[PDB]
Amino acid sequence: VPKVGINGFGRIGRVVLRNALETGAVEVVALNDPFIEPHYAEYMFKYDSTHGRFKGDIKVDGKDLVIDGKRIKFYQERDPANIPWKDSGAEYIVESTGVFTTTEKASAHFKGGAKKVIISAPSADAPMYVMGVNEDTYAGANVISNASCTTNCLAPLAKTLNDKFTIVEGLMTAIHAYTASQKTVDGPSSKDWRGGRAAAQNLIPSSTGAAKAVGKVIPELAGKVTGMSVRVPTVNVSLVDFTVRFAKDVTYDEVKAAIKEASEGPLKGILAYTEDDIVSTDILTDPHSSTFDAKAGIALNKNFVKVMSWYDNEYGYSRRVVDLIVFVSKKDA
Amino acid sequence: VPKVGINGFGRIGRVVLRNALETGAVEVVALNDPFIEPHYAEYMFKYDSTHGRFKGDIKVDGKDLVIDGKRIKFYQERDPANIPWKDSGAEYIVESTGVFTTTEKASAHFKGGAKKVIISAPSADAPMYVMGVNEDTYAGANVISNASCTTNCLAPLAKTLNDKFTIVEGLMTAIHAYTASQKTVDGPSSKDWRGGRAAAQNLIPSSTGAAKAVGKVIPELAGKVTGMSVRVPTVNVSLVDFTVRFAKDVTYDEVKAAIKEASEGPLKGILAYTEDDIVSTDILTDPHSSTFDAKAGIALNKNFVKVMSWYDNEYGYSRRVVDLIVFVSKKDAG
Amino acid sequence: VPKVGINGFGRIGRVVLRNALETGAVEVVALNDPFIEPHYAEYMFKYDSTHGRFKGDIKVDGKDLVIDGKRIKFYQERDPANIPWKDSGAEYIVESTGVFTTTEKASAHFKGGAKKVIISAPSADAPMYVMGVNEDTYAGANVISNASCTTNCLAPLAKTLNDKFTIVEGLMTAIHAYTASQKTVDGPSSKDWRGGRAAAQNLIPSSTGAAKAVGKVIPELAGKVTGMSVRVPTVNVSLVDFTVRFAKDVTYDEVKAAIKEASEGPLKGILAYTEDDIVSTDILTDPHSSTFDAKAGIALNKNFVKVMSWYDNEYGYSRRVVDLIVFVSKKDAG
Amino acid sequence: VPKVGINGFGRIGRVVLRNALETGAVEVVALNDPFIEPHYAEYMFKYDSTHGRFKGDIKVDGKDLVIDGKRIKFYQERDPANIPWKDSGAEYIVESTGVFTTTEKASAHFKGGAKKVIISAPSADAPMYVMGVNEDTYAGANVISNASCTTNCLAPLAKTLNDKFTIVEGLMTAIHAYTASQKTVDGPSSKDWRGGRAAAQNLIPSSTGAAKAVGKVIPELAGKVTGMSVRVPTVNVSLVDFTVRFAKDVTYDEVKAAIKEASEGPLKGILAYTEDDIVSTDILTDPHSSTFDAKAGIALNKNFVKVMSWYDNEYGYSRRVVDLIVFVSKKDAG
Numbered sequence A: 001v002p003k004v005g006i007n008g009f010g011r012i013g014r015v016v017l018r019n020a021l022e023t024g025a026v027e028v029v030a031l032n033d034p035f036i037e038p039h040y041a042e043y044m045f046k047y048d049s050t051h052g053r054f055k056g057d058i059k060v061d062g063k064d065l066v067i068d069g070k071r072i073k074f075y076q077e078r079d080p081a082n083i084p085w086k087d088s089g090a091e092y093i094v095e096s097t098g099v100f101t102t103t104e105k106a107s108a109h110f111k112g113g114a115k116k117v118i119i120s121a122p123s124a125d126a127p128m129y130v131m132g133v134n135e136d137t138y139a140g141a142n143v144i145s146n147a148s149c150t151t152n153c154l155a156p157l158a159k160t161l162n163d164k165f166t167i168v169e170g171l172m173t174a175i176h177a178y179t180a181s182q183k184t185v186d187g188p189s190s191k192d193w194r195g196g197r198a199a200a201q202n203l204i205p206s207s208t209g210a211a212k213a214v215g216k217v218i219p220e221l222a223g224k225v226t227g228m229s230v231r232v233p234t235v236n237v238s239l240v241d242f243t244v245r246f247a248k249d250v251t252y253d254e255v256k257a258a259i260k261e262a263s264e265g266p267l268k269g270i271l272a273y274t275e276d277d278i279v280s281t282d283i284l285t286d287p288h289s290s291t292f293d294a295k296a297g298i299a300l301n302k303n304f305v306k307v308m309s310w311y312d313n314e315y316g317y318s319r320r321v322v323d324l325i326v327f328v329s330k331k332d333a
Numbered sequence B, C, D: 001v002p003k004v005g006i007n008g009f010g011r012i013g014r015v016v017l018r019n020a021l022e023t024g025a026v027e028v029v030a031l032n033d034p035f036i037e038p039h040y041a042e043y044m045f046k047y048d049s050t051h052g053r054f055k056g057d058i059k060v061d062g063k064d065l066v067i068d069g070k071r072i073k074f075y076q077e078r079d080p081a082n083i084p085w086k087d088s089g090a091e092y093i094v095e096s097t098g099v100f101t102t103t104e105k106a107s108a109h110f111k112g113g114a115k116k117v118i119i120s121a122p123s124a125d126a127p128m129y130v131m132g133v134n135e136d137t138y139a140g141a142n143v144i145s146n147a148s149c150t151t152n153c154l155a156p157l158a159k160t161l162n163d164k165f166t167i168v169e170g171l172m173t174a175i176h177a178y179t180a181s182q183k184t185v186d187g188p189s190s191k192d193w194r195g196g197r198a199a200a201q202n203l204i205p206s207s208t209g210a211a212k213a214v215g216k217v218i219p220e221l222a223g224k225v226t227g228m229s230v231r232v233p234t235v236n237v238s239l240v241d242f243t244v245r246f247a248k249d250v251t252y253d254e255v256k257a258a259i260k261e262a263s264e265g266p267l268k269g270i271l272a273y274t275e276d277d278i279v280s281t282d283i284l285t286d287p288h289s290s291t292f293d294a295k296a297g298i299a300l301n302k303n304f305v306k307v308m309s310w311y312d313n314e315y316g317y318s319r320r321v322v323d324l325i326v327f328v329s330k331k332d333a334g
């Protein structure tokens, strides 16, 4: 199985490691985060406000972590060029700092001997992939992106609807949990002015390319889909709200059938289908990219419908990072 | 000038009272709520988790409330047929209990001498009005409805866009603060299973007739608009998300100009226009029905747009209740 | 293995069922809740905003629930005297509705054939027990009380410190999650004015007898301990803050060693001891009554100390309900 | 009136500016914050999630702010030694960055022409003052501290009780709103592991010198008071929980009378007294240091009592900064 390094031991970094240990699909052999010392890393991994306590064994030994018997090297370099990935055999680097999302910045990991870099975020210039949507277009690039949590929710849904019914145009709102880039109380934000307002007290509109990025992993939809997001006071779990017009005449039951069929077939494990009366906490720690909520949507007429899909923005995306490393390593061989 | 009675001294009942006192546009002379004694009512009106402390004077004087030197009768009748509205001269009754929303149930207020009843909610069998949209169609019905907060947000915006660009079809999501019918922890809500889950910890989808009701106050949009709601962990203030297709070709700048124009003219005080980077707390205790957020919307192409508009679901709607009573009282006088 | 019926399928009722299934220490064979139909009951038990999804299997078969293959009768009786506990063999009845906490009202279960009633709350007159503190004083009463979540947190801690150091006097604050009796938005609470204010937006002082009740389960502490609570914006998990004066001289390390010793011996599974840097979510779904937080306390001097102890007010208490039934059934048989 | 500069336009800096404008007691003529450009500063000041919209008028002119007609210079210097305070005549500097809390660091402001520096936080090596407690001990130090929000709450209460009843010993818990140092989701806080956990989902214990500092502003209480903090999911407003033993015998009514008397005389505007059933939001934007909550406290016996006092940790503290500057300016002038 691929040997993995994680740069940035944050929400995504720690949850990617949970998914690695849970599945065994990759072997995380090295960790880097200059703002966290090894003993502190043990604390942050063991206790989690969102996904509950870690259920395995973890201890510090020397400057390293030991998790269920396996040693993980822990470094504290601010410059990714100084991380010696080769000492542990770390070949596939998860770049989850949030500060090295361009190909140039991410490519620093090759200095320490990395083989591939997976940016855990959209990138201005690295090719983006969404498992179940366009992984087969992978063509060997050294630095790649797994897009965003929101794109991983919308794109499997949009691909399925387009294939069956032909999307003419669509607009998305992502009703999204607050994240680490937001603030407890009103303070300065680097992304945008609204982004700094008290996270747990506000609905906060936020612009996003993640719906437009659907048009890059699904070229047939370029220029046909865009949208925005509203950050809301939940610590985790988000909801895609997708209003879309089809070329074909559909009923809503036919929309549901198309989703159900994809969830039981080509997108099983990626796109789920439910008719239960679920709320956001029911999707906590669920590893799907996208769970279509049959009862939450509505059709106005035979061509114009609203559909809704849930995603654990931390947990589903993080499993997809693992899935994308496994797939790319197969192709590289 | 119009003398008002309020049945149900809840979020809407009390916030209607603050708007009456703030504007002086109506004189509230009587209140009824069987689950609040007069001393408790003073406390509930004095302190408010959402809109801050009442800035005036209030005291209890023997079963009555006195606010800024004016006596307000206070009753505790479970049956609205037993409220002697005539004793205080209350003629226009705000029916804001949530349990008397039909013409039959709301008509009980006439037994005690009410002249008109305004149901603070959509109604199955009473005409619905949205100020700035269709109040001129009022023709003397004795039981009327002020619709919902959400319809009061969407309809003035849809009217403006329809008038200027012709709406082909539109779908709405109301991202809505939690309310009194929701629960702190997972509890029974047998008629709305999701609505029983812990309110401040969940995103909670809900169906709503509020967008379809836009096609009832704007008959030209009948069959062209519907939508749903998502209840979210805020104590107040909500956000309409409107995805709409126009028959005419538009730029987003043209959409903004149409809204700004209406806000500076025929819908002043009802529909506001902003380009500021606001968030929900900035709309707290704002009396507009609808505040169009120009930087939050987006146009995909020349006919297909998503626009967003804020509303204080408590304070905007409550000011409209006062506005509607004034308007109807004037019409009842000629 | 005792056969249990649960009356009131609420937070405590459902979490008691979770604890019964998790441990197998009792067999829940019947449930009653008039406000929940069987298909709704499956939903409310399957999905939980606080403790997550149920990991086993559950379905409805006819009017019953089937959980992990076992059939569980489900009734919908408003009057507990009409619940036919006998049909399923239910002998030990968890009275978790919140509304039948006196012996007079709780005794209604005996009509349907109950053998014992455990009130999931303090009782005005039924004897109260805290596992680890006074269950040996149980003498065969047919209606008993498992006290409150807070008493179950404070009393095992107070007993240990009293046994070792002699408590002269103590005052407690329970920093407590909000509960089902609180309100999402400012609402009517005629017997607890503060308790009606928006739960997720306020710190809400509240008086409690739960610290004085430590004086009933530990009679030597009668009149030496009381306190109050503050209800805070968390959906679950609470924290006892105990400020206490000892007759003996102690260091804070001796305080810690006494609690660690108790946690490894006589109070294992009831009182836990930690030096970790935990926060409230770390105690979610933790079955202990009391988790002493070593780093959160502080000593002013050799006789005056502040200790703090965590408790999942739903899950800890609910496991104690299961433990108490087990203990009492053993006593009933020898 | 004194001319003021503010280094650090954060929660305290902006709420200090609001208090200066509200009272006119000082004239703010310059601001510095390298992370907030002028147009961003206008937005952050105009719109506040906690205290609401700014009521006055504000605009940017070039690189400076203009607020209600007066120009305010705005700099973005990361090194306070480079702020040209003299250009605007700013003499009294509010040091509210959180990062220059020592006499050596705060002294950087003198390079730019400042006359006095008031650190908006406790300091390891500058004298701390609490208005109503020890401001008369000021004797011309050039770098002073206004202590913390929590010490400004506890000290006036502790002085009053100790003056009348003699405090033998006391322990405090500050139930405290979360602040800008905390995190929205679990993130790094290597000096305070608990302080990194999701602020709005957790109760978070924390050590604090704020209770011990009461023994520094009140030397007669040295060694007799300490405590800790629990950070909770509110955006603002905190609650002091003070458990104290007196040397004299007292009733609770006598405790109440002593607090009320102080609130009406020497501590007016500093310590408030209430018997209302208030909750945290009722203290929002209240400028008192300390609001004694009569009904929330409890006496165990004639010497052992728990008292509770509310404080808007942003607004009360900020008004005290303004008050301290006024007082120091008058003493500086004779």
Ligand SMILES: NC(=O)c1ccc[n+]([C@@H]2O[C@H](COP(=O)([O-])OP(=O)(O)OC[C@H]3O[C@@H](n4cnc5c(N)ncnc54)[C@H](O)[C@@H]3O)[C@@H](O)[C@H]2O)c1
Pocket: A007, A008, A009, A010, A011, A012, A013, A032, A033, A034, A035, A036, A077, A078, A079, A080, A096, A097, A098, A099, A101, A120, A121, A148, A149, A179, A180, A181, A313, A314, A317, D186, D187, D188
């Ligand atoms: N949280 C989500 O829902 C989510 C979902 C999908 C993608 N993402 C993306 O994943 C990335 C990480 O997000 P997050 O939520 O985990 O953020 P986070 O703040 O929780 O974690 C980022 C971590 O990177 C560390 N770091 C900072 N500078 C560093 C450096 N120079 N070298 C190494 N480590 C450094 C920080 O200490 C922190 O622990 C971001 O790009 C984000 O946009 C986040």
Ligand SMILES: NC(=O)c1ccc[n+]([C@@H]2O[C@H](COP(=O)([O-])OP(=O)(O)OC[C@H]3O[C@@H](n4cnc5c(N)ncnc54)[C@H](O)[C@@H]3O)[C@@H](O)[C@H]2O)c1
Pocket: B007, B008, B009, B010, B011, B012, B013, B032, B033, B034, B035, B036, B077, B078, B079, B080, B096, B097, B098, B099, B120, B121, B148, B149, B179, B180, B181, B313, B314, B317, C186, C187, C188
């Ligand atoms: N809250 C909102 O945002 C909002 C906005 C627009 C409209 N509304 C509508 O306004 C109505 C009231 O909503 P609310 O949020 O104020 O609810 P609420 O629960 O806060 O208020 C209801 C009040 O009615 C009282 N009441 C109950 N039974 C009564 C009776 N028999 N006689 C007299 N009074 C009685 C209750 O004691 C309570 O004080 C509802 O129909 C709601 O749909 C609410």
Ligand SMILES: NC(=O)c1ccc[n+]([C@@H]2O[C@H](COP(=O)([O-])OP(=O)(O)OC[C@H]3O[C@@H](n4cnc5c(N)ncnc54)[C@H](O)[C@@H]3O)[C@@H](O)[C@H]2O)c1
Pocket: B186, B187, B188, C007, C008, C009, C010, C011, C012, C013, C032, C033, C034, C035, C036, C077, C078, C079, C080, C096, C097, C098, C099, C120, C121, C148, C149, C179, C180, C181, C313, C314, C317
């Ligand atoms: N939640 C806690 O933290 C906690 C902890 C310890 C003890 N308790 C006590 O346990 C009891 C239950 O509390 P809860 O938090 O589970 O409340 P809850 O509201 O979650 O549960 C009450 C349940 O009882 C049902 N009920 C109402 N009337 C009934 C009737 N006549 N017959 C049968 N069922 C009826 C309701 O439908 C509801 O499902 C209360 O007395 C409470 O004080 C609660």
Ligand SMILES: NC(=O)c1ccc[n+]([C@@H]2O[C@H](COP(=O)([O-])OP(=O)(O)OC[C@H]3O[C@@H](n4cnc5c(N)ncnc54)[C@H](O)[C@@H]3O)[C@@H](O)[C@H]2O)c1
Pocket: A186, A187, A188, D007, D008, D009, D010, D011, D012, D013, D032, D033, D034, D035, D036, D077, D078, D079, D080, D096, D097, D098, D099, D120, D121, D148, D149, D179, D180, D181, D313, D314, D317
């Ligand atoms: N918030 C409270 O309740 C409270 C109460 C009393 C005291 N305090 C104290 O006041 C101080 C500020 O607290 P806050 O809550 O306002 O924090 P905050 O983060 O809201 O404000 C800090 C401000 O200082 C600015 N800043 C950072 N580095 C700077 C530099 N080199 N030069 C100039 N400005 C810089 C930041 O941009 C930010 O605007 C802290 O010392 C805090 O302990 C806070």
